[PDB]
Amino acid sequence: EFPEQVINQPMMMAARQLHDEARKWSSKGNDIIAAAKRMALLMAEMSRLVRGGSGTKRALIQCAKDIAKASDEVTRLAKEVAKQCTDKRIRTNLLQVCERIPTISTQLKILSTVKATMLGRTNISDEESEQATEMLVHNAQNLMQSVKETVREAEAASIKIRTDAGFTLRWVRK
């Protein structure tokens, strides 16, 4: 429900790739999916902000902060799922992929800051500015890839549950 194709093609691409993996499921009773959908929507806002020129400084910053908020919740919940999983194979893969999330999301706040201050500047070099933007896209690509890998191993680890009493996300295909 994001649509086909003044943004940043590769950020929107990454935004869309996450969106599609999470739109596969209903958000109802699955905050992992709700958060994932949110991040994807804020990633899209970012490719837009990445052209912004100015007035985008403050926004670009807030936006990156927003995103990190969303990942912190994907992680937090991914962990409760892993804590309920009874399959070492899966419980492991889950923790593995969701550990990096926080890190990637932090690189993202940092990279976005440099980018923000660079916005407006005329003195900054050509090579410097297109490079700032490409580390952003790179980090964004990997943040999205990580969030979507979680969601899939979160779903896999929803299968063998220690107690139906503990935590549970709702996995209902749309």
């Binding site: 994001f2 910053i61 807030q62």
Partner: protein
């Protein structure tokens, strides 16, 4: 002029509620939020409401994002 305004620059994770809260001081007759575009299409009670909305809300900040409120491009 008209009573239709269009808002640009909304947050990525904006909700319809937030828009309605934003313009809590007006009578919404129509309200369509485009989450993929961060743009809203509101329709107000009359010419004056659309004016006051534009004036209060063009260039203000919504969660750290600068808004651009203007008459729906006709």
């Amino acid at each position: 002029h008209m009573r239709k305004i269009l808002i640009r620059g909304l947050p990525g994770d904006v909700t319809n509620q937030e828009v309605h809260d934003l313009l809590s001081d007006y009578e919404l007759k129509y309200c369509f939020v485009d989450k993929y575009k961060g743009t809203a299409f509101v329709t107000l009670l009359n010419g004056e409401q659309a004016e006051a909305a534009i004036n209060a809300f063009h260039q203000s900040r919504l969660r750290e994002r600068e808004l651009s409120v203007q008459l729906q491009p006709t």
